[PDB]
Amino acid sequence: DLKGPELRILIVHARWNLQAIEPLVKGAVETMIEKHDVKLENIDIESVPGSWELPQGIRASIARNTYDAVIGIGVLIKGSTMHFEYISEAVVHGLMRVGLDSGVPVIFGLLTVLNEEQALYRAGLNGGHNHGNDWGSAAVEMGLKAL
C-alpha cells in the first residue's frame, strides 16, 4: 500500500556474525524495492565493525548526506561474561538517541539473542520469518510520515 520512490534510505550494519546479518540486510532491501517501489540507487548500505559502533556510524552518516529513514542492523549473542548485557543496553539507548536528536527515523534492526540458532531463525532461516522484511516496510512508512 505504501510506495516511496523518492525516498533515500540508509542501512548501517555491523559485520560480526555475517551468517545472520546478510539475510537480514538482503530482506530489508528486497522488501523495499519489490514491495515499496524504492529505487536501488537510493539505498546506501554502510557497515561498521560491531554493534557498538552502530549509533556512531549512523550519526556520522546522517550528518554528511540526507536520508529519510535509517535502519541499524546488528546481532548480539549472550556470551560467558556480562558483556552482552551492557553492550546491548548502551547500543539500544544509543540508537534511540541518534534518532531523537537528528529528527531522522531510526529503525531498530538489532537482534539480542541467547544463541546463534535464535538469530538465524529471525533471519528467515530454518523455517523462521525474516525480520529484515519488517524493518524495510517500517523504514518506508516512517520515511513518508516524516515527509
Residue 28 carries which DSSP code? H
x/- track of binding to a second copy for residues 20-49 (CB under 8 A):
--------------------------x-xx
x/- track of binding to a second copy for residues 62-91 (CB under 8 A):
-xx-------------x-xxxx-xxxxxxx
Nearest to 113 by CA among 78, 81, 74: 78
Distances (CA, A) of 81 to 9, 77, 85, 107: 36, 11, 9, 28
2 is a contact residue toward a second copy (CB under 8 A): no
User: Nearest approach, Cβ of 71 to a second copy (angstroms)?
Assistant: 11
Number of residues that bind a second copy (CB under 8 A): 59
Nearest to 88 by CA among 72, 102, 100: 72
Question: Is residue 136 within 8 Å of 32, Cβ to Cβ?
Answer: yes
Closer CB to a second copy, 27 or 105, in the complex:
105
> For residue 108, what are the β-bridge partners?
72
| Residues lying near a second copy in the complex (CB under 8 A) | 15-18, 46, 48-50, 52-53, 55-57, 59-60, 63-64, 78, 80-83, 85-101, 103, 105-108, 110-114, 118, 122, 134, 137-138, 141-142, 145-147
